[PDB]
Amino acid sequence: GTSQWLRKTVDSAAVILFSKTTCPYCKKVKDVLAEAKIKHATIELDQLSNGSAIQKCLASFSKIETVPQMFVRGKFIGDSQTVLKYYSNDELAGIVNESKYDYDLIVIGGGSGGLAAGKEAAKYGAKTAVLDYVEPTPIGTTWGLGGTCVNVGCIPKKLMHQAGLLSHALEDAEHFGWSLDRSKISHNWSTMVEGVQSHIGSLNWGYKVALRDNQVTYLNAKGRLISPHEVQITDKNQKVSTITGNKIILATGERPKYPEIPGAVEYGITSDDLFSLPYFPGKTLVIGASYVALECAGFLASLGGDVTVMVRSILLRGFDQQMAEKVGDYMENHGVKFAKLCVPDEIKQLKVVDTENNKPGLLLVKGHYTDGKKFEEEFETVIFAVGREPQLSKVLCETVGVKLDKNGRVVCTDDEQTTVSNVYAIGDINAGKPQLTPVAIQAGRYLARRLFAGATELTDYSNVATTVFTPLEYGACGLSEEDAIEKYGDKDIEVYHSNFKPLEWTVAHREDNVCYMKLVCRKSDNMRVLGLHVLGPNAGEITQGYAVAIKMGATKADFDRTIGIHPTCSETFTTLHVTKKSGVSPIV
Amino acid sequence: GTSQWLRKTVDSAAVILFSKTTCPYCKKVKDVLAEAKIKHATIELDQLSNGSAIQKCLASFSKIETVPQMFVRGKFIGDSQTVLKYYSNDELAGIVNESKYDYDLIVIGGGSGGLAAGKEAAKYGAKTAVLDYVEPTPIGTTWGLGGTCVNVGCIPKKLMHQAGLLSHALEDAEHFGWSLDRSKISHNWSTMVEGVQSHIGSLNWGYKVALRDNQVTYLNAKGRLISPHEVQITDKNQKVSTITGNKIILATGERPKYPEIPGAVEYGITSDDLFSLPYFPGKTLVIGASYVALECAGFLASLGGDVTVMVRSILLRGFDQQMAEKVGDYMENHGVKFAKLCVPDEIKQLKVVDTENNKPGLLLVKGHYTDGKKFEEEFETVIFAVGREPQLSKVLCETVGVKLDKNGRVVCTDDEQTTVSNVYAIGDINAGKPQLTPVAIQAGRYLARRLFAGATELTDYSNVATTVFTPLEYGACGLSEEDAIEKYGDKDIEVYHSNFKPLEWTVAHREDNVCYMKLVCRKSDNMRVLGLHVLGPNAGEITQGYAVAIKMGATKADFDRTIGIHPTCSETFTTLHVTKKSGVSPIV
Ligand SMILES: Cc1cc2nc3c(=O)[nH]c(=O)nc-3n(C[C@H](O)[C@H](O)[C@H](O)COP(=O)(O)OP(=O)(O)OC[C@H]3O[C@@H](n4cnc5c(N)ncnc54)[C@H](O)[C@@H]3O)c2cc1C
Ligand SMILES: Cc1cc2nc3c(=O)[nH]c(=O)nc-3n(C[C@H](O)[C@H](O)[C@H](O)COP(=O)(O)OP(=O)(O)OC[C@H]3O[C@@H](n4cnc5c(N)ncnc54)[C@H](O)[C@@H]3O)c2cc1C
Ligand SMILES: NCCCCN1CCN(CCO)CC1
Ligand SMILES: NCCCCN1CCN(CCO)CC1
């Protein structure tokens, strides 16, 4: 396998030095390169068990077996004496810059994955371009560099969640002795949005600076891959041109879906619009039951809004349904109305949005329930959160040969390679993978290392933890209870569970026996923890550390032998004892 | 080892049934016992690899090898037919109640460990008494059942911490759009104390009910162990009597120390008094530098108080000193004054505490700095937080033979046994162990199971995680950096670290590059994580889950291959890359 790896590494790396840590000829080359500001990968063969075998395989490229050996874009460039020859003759810059292509790497999409991949690639001397373009929403909303999470996803969503959480902090403060009267305090949407947008602006600008400082070319243009190595770019002046790249990373992400009903595109909005909305949404209908729908409904209600969620069938399909029900029950008990078993038929406009005074319009929503009753109610804002979809029609001519699945996502090997061998896909468009920002970042950084620094490590997509930032947060890692029972059978599954009450909730007069956690375990495999689930405050902070233990194969006994930190919510995971099979109540 | 275990189990258990899950004679006995409300341990021999060997050893006690076999206090009582004979002749109740001693277990001390041990023992039929008495503080403060954590420790301390955190939540709320004016809001100490005390009262009462419901005798009396099995009790009427017990658990905890300077006992207070203080402390001096001192100083300052901490030498001796400095620096930058390298000489009274109007008195504190300058300043309240000490002189006549160490703590084996073989010690008085509430609870529950249900599992006291609930919280699990370098040498230690900024702090205009985390790893052992350290919000929730992974032997690679949850503080542990040896700045 050593020779397979070395061939792939030499072919792909942009600038790479084979070295040993204790070799002064190697250091001589390193210092010349550093002085010339020539970035490169380095592989220290004295730190690899098969280092000696690697030296022998190198002769198949260089005709020599010694270190250092320098390669550029698949070609042996020289040992120490040859590199210094090139340097002293001012030939080195031209050598390391010579390529069949404009770039070693073109990233199509400047989001979580694409920026992470581009930045990491540049570190190893890959001449990199990042293309990003934000197609405006139907009402004209656009935003800057950084992708969905940064501009219209995880970042503003969690900031507006925090704004919502502060509502309950204001309420709690009275019970803890502060002289506040919560009932006399109101929230100003536009003040919040301005703060959120100023932070997002600092991230847009930070990315542009980061790319400039790492010698990455940022093009604000739409890229279309028209052949394996050619990207056609359309700038914002509609000027069309072609750039070429050795490796291509597709990292274009997804956009919200609209249902095909009259009025939806014209008068509704999506999460793309919400996070910079220049007017307060007012009385709001969220159509959908995804984590986006419930997160958005949740903070709008905590900010004091009149909020309704229209649910076709179930909440959070694909998540543990016991937990999803507890999530929704909390929301319903804390202001959020649910129109259950209900779908929309038509959105009619009653008032146009007030651009001058930053006030919402007014809409009539007509729909129907499964029981035959009609739904007809007025809302100032209607948000569709009914799924997201890739957009690759607009980014690959189908003649390039990149295989998509029936949903339009890219079919990849376990090292992110598409059916076109120099083209890779990462992030939400990679079929079958968890659609999460840290997944995209790890995928892109690890891919860049394999392409340009000879790394072999793959991204592990199993047991990736998640958190839904609903008013009461839901963190999870591993299998839902129903999926575990489906895979292994009910007789091989034991579930330990407990309610709990945050200490913070006692003086504040909040609920007993609402926060809840469970471990779904496999009896025949030493009570291996297959899935962990927690409903409670700070659920992402709670869950994260356990994901390391679950990756390592934690069992129930590993949890039991660990000592809790007191007083915390998380410590209840270390003393669980009630099983579901026992029928004993989990209340405390 | 099987026969050693069985002898110890039979001798110690109060009521125990040797059984098999699939034996209807065993079930016959179980149902009789359950109907008679006779609580017992059960050991199902068909679930132990050495079950068959256990059956053979039982003959050494019972002259039989079959199941079921019932034992009471070291004596074989019968098989199924004999047990039902006793039942039908109404002899069973007297059989299972016969003992040389009044109780199978006497717990001296009704705190975290003692209540946990007593409750768990009762579950297996041990006739149990829990003794608790709260010696009043010098000003007369007393409290109810539950120990230090519940009444004057972890519980009220974290509630008052929450009250302090809400100060910053009120400030943040304005930036997130709420119409509050933080500058016009004040805090009312006594309203907070009343809420805290109402919660503590619910815990005092909850424990009394829990004990009653588990048939545990609660005696509000001071116990003195006068021989191995005799406890002399003095009730609150000063009536003296003697009760006897088979096993004795010492769980009496510690109390605050006072320095031997004029005025300290008369005019200062400790944490014992603070948490129910009927008057607001006002301008406060905390003498000390323990986690108690800094936690108390911290919330008093966040509540708006004028607070000074007098530090003899360093903060948080025994904790990682880089982290301790960062903890103190945050406090100093957020209101807390520090009188460094300073000790007190005298406390003089200037005003007596106002019992009618619930106002503090006034004190003059005289002290001196190491540089020879005098300290002389007035404070309304002076809190000593200069360590805690066991009190066992008042609980064991020294003739019983329980060995204490030079600090007065009980010298125990790894199964909590003292030098008197029926007497055990748990919690803070157990020499050498981490002095934490979940440690005491695990120790007591696991000990009760070994004593009365034949368990073998010991408490693991290694890598016990902690959190200091200072204004910016500090969570830790494992070795400090300096202890790791001392044990293994600097060349075998690699430290990965990073600053971070909570997303919640961006819109709120709080600090960059103040929150901080590090992993202290051992190079020669696959980069094993020896210690984890985090300064940031919710640090106990962050740290807890990682303690499971560290117990399992997590390496840096285990952290790296785990995917972060975004956006959280904790996820930064999954992408650390800057080493201290590299000299690269950890700022982000
Ligand atoms: C409301 C919402 C909340 C979310 N909350 C979380 C959360 O809390 N935690 C979490 O982990 N994940 C969250 N996500 C998911 C997270 O945003 C995505 O998983 C992540 O952004 C995906 O990154 P990506 O690189 O795959 O694509 P994206 O970040 O979407 O970036 C793709 C970029 O490429 C652009 N582009 C598309 N086509 C082209 C083209 N031809 N040429 C040039 N540029 C193009 C796109 O406009 C975009 O800028 C949330 C998503 C949403 C919608
Ligand atoms: C200010 C403060 C804050 C703390 N914060 C935390 C935290 O956040 N997390 C954490 O894990 N730990 C915390 N601790 C430590 C925690 O309180 C102790 O580790 C825990 O309470 C120890 O339990 P214990 O069973 O050993 O003794 P204790 O809980 O102290 O109980 C001993 C009981 O026995 C009584 N007693 C003593 N002698 C006798 C006698 N002869 N007869 C009858 N009764 C007697 C005592 O009055 C007491 O009621 C804190 C401690 C303090 C002082
Ligand atoms: N947009 C699709 C959402 C469903 C994705 N689910 C995958 C498995 N994870 C693991 C936690 O149990 C739960 C969420
Ligand atoms: N009252 C004594 C306080 C010192 C106790 N220390 C022990 C080791 N733990 C592990 C975390 O590194 C830190 C705290």
XYZ file of C-alpha atoms in Angstrom, chain B residues 7-9 11-13 104-109 113-114 117 121 225 227-229 231 245-253 392 395-396 400-404 409-431 433 440 443-452 455 457-459 461:
78
model
C -17.811 -15.390 53.551
C -17.608 -11.591 53.666
C -20.990 -11.263 51.923
C -21.306 -12.171 57.359
C -22.238 -8.596 56.416
C -25.603 -8.774 54.643
C -27.503 -3.048 60.957
C -26.095 0.379 60.068
C -25.662 3.607 62.000
C -24.627 6.612 59.904
C -23.059 9.393 61.963
C -23.681 12.471 59.804
C -22.480 10.821 51.747
C -24.312 9.711 54.864
C -25.319 5.492 52.147
C -28.470 0.356 52.673
C -18.758 6.415 68.719
C -16.832 1.557 71.138
C -16.911 -0.286 67.784
C -20.666 -0.980 67.954
C -22.973 5.122 69.580
C -25.057 -0.901 65.334
C -23.343 -3.641 63.375
C -21.714 -1.406 60.727
C -20.926 2.230 61.427
C -20.423 4.846 58.731
C -18.645 8.048 59.770
C -19.847 10.825 57.462
C -19.522 13.928 59.664
C -17.867 16.298 57.205
C -13.810 14.138 64.862
C -17.385 12.086 67.465
C -14.927 9.322 68.363
C -12.133 3.176 69.886
C -9.056 2.705 67.708
C -9.975 4.618 64.514
C -6.734 5.953 63.061
C -6.626 9.644 62.109
C -9.020 12.908 58.818
C -9.768 9.207 58.875
C -7.212 6.856 57.324
C -9.123 4.379 55.167
C -8.472 1.447 52.880
C -9.610 1.642 49.276
C -12.996 0.222 50.355
C -13.506 3.005 52.964
C -12.738 0.730 55.903
C -11.125 2.309 58.962
C -8.751 0.591 61.353
C -11.871 -0.680 63.192
C -13.163 -3.263 60.810
C -16.942 -2.584 61.109
C -16.427 1.213 60.893
C -16.130 3.016 57.546
C -15.580 6.666 56.624
C -16.863 8.503 53.556
C -16.899 12.031 52.209
C -14.715 14.919 53.264
C -13.324 13.220 56.401
C -11.837 10.360 54.356
C -8.182 11.255 54.112
C -9.923 11.839 48.675
C -19.280 11.280 48.808
C -18.642 6.328 47.921
C -21.625 5.902 50.220
C -23.911 4.196 47.718
C -21.200 1.818 46.524
C -20.143 1.031 50.117
C -23.735 0.251 51.108
C -23.954 -2.184 48.200
C -20.768 -3.977 49.214
C -21.869 -4.201 52.832
C -25.412 -5.368 52.320
C -21.255 -6.002 45.553
C -17.278 -2.499 42.922
C -15.065 0.142 44.534
C -15.302 3.895 44.059
C -11.243 8.425 42.979
